[PDB]
Ligand binder design. Sequence first.
Ligand code: MG
Ligand code: MG
Lengths: 442, 442, 442
Amino acid sequence: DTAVLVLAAGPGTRMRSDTPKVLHTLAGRSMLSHVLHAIAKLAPQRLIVVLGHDHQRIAPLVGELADTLGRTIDVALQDRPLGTGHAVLCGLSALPDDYAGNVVVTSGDTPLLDADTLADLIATHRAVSAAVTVLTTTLDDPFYGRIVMAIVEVNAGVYAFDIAALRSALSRLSSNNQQELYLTDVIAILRSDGQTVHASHVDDSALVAGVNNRVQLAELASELNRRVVAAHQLAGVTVVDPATTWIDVDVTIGRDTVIHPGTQLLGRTQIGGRCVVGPDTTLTDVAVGDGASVVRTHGSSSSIGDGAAVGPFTYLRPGTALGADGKLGAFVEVKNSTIGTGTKVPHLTYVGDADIGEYSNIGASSVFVNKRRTTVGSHVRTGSDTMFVAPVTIGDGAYTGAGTVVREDVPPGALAVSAGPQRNIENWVQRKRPGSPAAQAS
Amino acid sequence: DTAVLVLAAGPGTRMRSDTPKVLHTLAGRSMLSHVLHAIAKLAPQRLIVVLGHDHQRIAPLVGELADTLGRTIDVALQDRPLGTGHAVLCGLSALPDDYAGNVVVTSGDTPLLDADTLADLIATHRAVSAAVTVLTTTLDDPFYGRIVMAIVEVNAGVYAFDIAALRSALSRLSSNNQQELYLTDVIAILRSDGQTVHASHVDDSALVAGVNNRVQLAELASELNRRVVAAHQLAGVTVVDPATTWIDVDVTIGRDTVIHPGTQLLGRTQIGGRCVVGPDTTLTDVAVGDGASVVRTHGSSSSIGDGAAVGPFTYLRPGTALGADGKLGAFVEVKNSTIGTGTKVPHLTYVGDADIGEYSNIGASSVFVNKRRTTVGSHVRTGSDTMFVAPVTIGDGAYTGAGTVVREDVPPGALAVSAGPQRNIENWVQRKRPGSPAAQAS
Amino acid sequence: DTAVLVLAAGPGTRMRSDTPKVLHTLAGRSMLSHVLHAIAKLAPQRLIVVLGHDHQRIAPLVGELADTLGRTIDVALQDRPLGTGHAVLCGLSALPDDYAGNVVVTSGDTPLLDADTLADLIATHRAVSAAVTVLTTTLDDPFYGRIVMAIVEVNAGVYAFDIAALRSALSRLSSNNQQELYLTDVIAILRSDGQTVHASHVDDSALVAGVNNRVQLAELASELNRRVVAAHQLAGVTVVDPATTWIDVDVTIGRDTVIHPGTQLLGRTQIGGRCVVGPDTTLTDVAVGDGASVVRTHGSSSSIGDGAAVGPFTYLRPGTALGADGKLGAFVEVKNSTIGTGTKVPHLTYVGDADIGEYSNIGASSVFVNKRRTTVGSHVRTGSDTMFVAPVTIGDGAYTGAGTVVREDVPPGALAVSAGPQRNIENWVQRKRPGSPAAQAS
Ligand SMILES: [Mg+2]
Ligand SMILES: [Mg+2]
């Protein structure tokens, strides 16, 4: 039996933020969520999180996280900002007084720490019957106090403890130094009691790296990102420039797709196999089938079918569904609309809140204007500069003239027109502009 | 009393440029301007710049720089390309023959050298009563002759001197070697005269790094850029990808704003707090209020109010002012135009040389065509595909139909229309296209 | 006389690809093409490539490569997947039994190896009368068996041999270990025969780096890219951000042009001198004259004349020719069209399959709709929202009204119109919308 305490109670001062440090995000999850996902993979019997400013936070634990993870996470509060030693004391109150098992202590600002690293700590600790084991790592420039004697190779800030050793070393602890009670002092107290102080060493330094400021945040965002890219590359995805390709965790991509530079794939986006994600593409929660091209596109909450072509310069808003072999071309925007198999919207148009059938063609520079919705049939051909004033129904195989405004329904196989006929005014430019265009004409 | 000489007289051959080496830019200023800004912070009593090809240059010193800095910068010319030793001799002529104080010598191609580094040099030099002190630094791969004995840990190329020692060591100097007179030889001459040769060492190597070619230029542009980003991050700005975020010096940004990858912020741009600068945004001299979003936008000389939304795919030309809570959407361009509080230009339009009031809506795919100017009132709603042929006045709460061309004024609360009415040609496609669209209709 | 064998017969398993490893590309050429281009520069008397899955491959050697290189490349097949030792045996069959000269052996997955490195190997080998020489290099983390005794400073995998020594050491070779015949074992066999084993060492490690997976592919793509950028920078091209500028081999760029971040220049693209390639530009096979600006543009198979301006947000499709001093502005797309000296297409238009003369102006938000082609004369001014329904001829100095649909020819100096006249409906908004826009009007 192991109880895990996450200390998330500090102020996060040097973030210079009105957003609590621990709720700051990277690769798709907040630091706290990254911390709790790794620990939940470990599955200890008791998992407890300790808080300071607690109203914003407590809501997202358990509420959202204990559910998403399908387990209980207890929360303990820390009324006075006493320090990490006291925080640990606050977390222990949530255990039955007669609690038997080990206690592992961690923070909420190490977003890379993983279940294996935690498991190895617990394993070394039971192996040597320890009392206390402390995780460490070795660096180039130590700042990160420093490391078994004691603590001022640095200290990771992650500990396994014997509950009886811990409760006792804590009962006898002071303050004078910042003016708080550190947990590091538990190591020196148990050394006085002639206790065994063990230390599990982590070769991979970035797994236990913490975030105190926005410079360090960007660093770990960067390292985590390299590791998600390299995992996709090794499964069969070409990433031309891993330095300018941000891929969130969860995002899935398949065999032989090519990802070109300047691309972010975010949230729960999925890419099928054999795709081309061109350059400068940003997709959050977008699903793409196999053999599709998505180039210079900014899109979210949408789906793009197999062998379809989107880009360059296309904007997809929430609720867009484009069928297989479909096309959205340059300078098009689509919001909350369904577009069938094989249909093409190639240029300078906006399609909002409509449904379009299959193998239809929408002419350049058109607009769907506004609970009824416009509906357009299959094999329909609309001419350039058509405005579709909602709601309106266009039947299968219908056509529209260039420069038409559609305000009424159009039957299957009718041509809808409105533009007046062309008149030429001979020698106008000679008379109304004498100079320039006038000459030529001459 | 200290006189500072900047040697800016060499040809800059391996830049392979028709632009004088010293006028090549990074982070917003030319190398020379970066050099003179640091020295002007030092505030010596005499500041003198020595030139070779001098017509392009002399204009920007003092002219532009001595003003901007509000002090005098004397200029000395160097008629024959004799070398750095002679250049220094040329610079000394601009001093009263009976000049008392120290002489500090620097180049115009170290754009990172700062006032502190200069101050420490002067301080060490007076501390030991020196005659000559020379700045040095230590590197991985020395190229950068090499360092107290003499000079072939490398030599920075920055010196403090006693004026009497300097004038004397210079009077006795030769040429044979390139075939010029080096200043490095002053160190070996004063060593013969048994003089004290001191040396101030700089740990931060990049402060004294110089630029001889375009590979080194990009390097220092890169290093300076990391340091401007990290300063913003530590003040409370999230930069998701510091490697692809170019921020010029002077640019100011505020608390809790988020800057997404592929963004350049240039010239005297200002970002308020709580903003989102999405990805792929380039802004030169643009001012943005608090809580505004600016995503995939290319803009200059413009202002965007509080809580406004611009992007993705928007182009702002000089003289654009957008009020608070305003909106410019995808595929819009705006030049020299004022747009009031709460007004929205959401799609595929161009607005040139107009003024628009508050809480108005401009319909998709419209154009403001051309000393009079078009003026549009508040709470106005224009329909899609409207062309506003300047000059024209649209009164408050007026409307426009889809596909209207406005050539005349529209009173408060009138609807302006021009499009003809819709006609349907039944069974047209059967007759004019037998095959395809024809079937369906069937 | 030297015969060069390229071993391109392995499966490439950890690429996780349906595209043969050796046909995977970087900087414009496949790895195999990069390998054969370097060797063809060497010009040995016999060049032979050995294959496994061979149908896709054999076609591109010689077919395409032996031609492009203007020499013969023989191909040898390897029926059973026996290993590199056997592959070499298969390659030797393509030599006359009585072959006299040296044999150099290389792979098809080292895309950086160059002719000098090959020449130095051959030179060291003849210098010491060797039998076998093996190329080596020294690394930070060896994985890359390891190096004269034998092979488990690592082994490059490139060898020079005496033909008689090689044929003999090969005749006596086994299998048990993977379960194949390695060529590394030839080194240990000739050591038994007391033969001289020489070893040419390569300081530049990246020249002999190989690609087994997509992580290593991106690495070498990155290194090759740094070296092409630095060569352009040293010839007089400013690259603001070499990390986000992909330039393919062959691409040429000239003096004093500036390349801004996020730019790929691909295929056989050429940039003249004094240009500005803004940020976020992607050009494949595009030719640009001197003094032109190309900003936020995605283009291919096209040409842009001297002092012309394209961008931001412009899309060029194959067959676009734009003359000198021409302009394509924001949100324009052009396919297979010719546009003369001095003509401007500034906003929100599409131009497909047309020819346009000189000093013409095309008004915002227009479309060229479809063997005849539309033709537009010089000094022509078309108004906004004009649809040109192909085919149609517009004569020199002709004009068009705003919101015109052109279906018929327009003579030199005529004005073409079609839009109806403007009508205002007074007090419409009071009656049809009581609330909001209604008030004002009040
Ligand atoms: Mg239109
Ligand atoms: Mg129209």
